[PDB]
């Protein structure tokens, strides 16, 4: 499947409840304040949660950090690597 297939997973796993926990992470490296946030914020977010990212998932991240770290991405996004971690890895 594509991300876009995950996204649509993502919203529907967890509940808008769940969610507004994770978006509290999610607003730590939020400068504006409003779904926007570094590709580097997102692999800080699984620390603090305490939840592993998945091989593609934290390897996708490291690249982006890696040549940028600048580029931002929306709660969506974020969603999205977040579940698609907890999906296949345990």
Same mark, same amino acid.
């Not at 808008?16 to 509290?24: G, V």
């Not at 977010?45 to 770290?69: C, Q």
């Given at each position: 499947?594509?991300?876009? @297939? !995950?996204?649509?997973?993502?919203?529907? &796993? *967890?509940?808008?409840?769940?969610?507004?926990? &994770?978006?509290?992470? &999610?607003?730590?490296?939020?400068? =504006?304040?409003?779904? =926007?946030?570094? #590709?580097?914020?997102?692999? $800080?977010?699984?620390?603090? !949660?305490?939840?592993?990212?998945?091989?593609?998932? *934290? +390897? #996708? *991240?490291?690249?982006?950090? +890696?040549? @940028?770290?600048?580029? $931002?991405?929306?709660?969506?996004?974020? !969603?999205? *690597?977040?579940? #698609?971690?907890?999906?296949? +890895?345990?």
């Amino acid at each position: 499947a594509s991300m876009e @297939d !995950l996204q649509a997973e993502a919203r529907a &796993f *967890l509940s808008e409840e769940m969610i507004a926990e &994770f978006k509290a992470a &999610f607003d730590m490296f939020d400068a =504006d304040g409003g779904g =926007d946030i570094s #590709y580097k914020a997102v692999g $800080t977010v699984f620390r603090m !949660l305490g939840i592993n990212p998945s091989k593609e998932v *934290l +390897d #996708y *991240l490291k690249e982006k950090i +890696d040549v @940028d770290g600048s580029g $931002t991405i929306d709660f969506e996004e974020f !969603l999205v *690597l977040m579940v #698609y971690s907890m999906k296949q +890895d345990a």
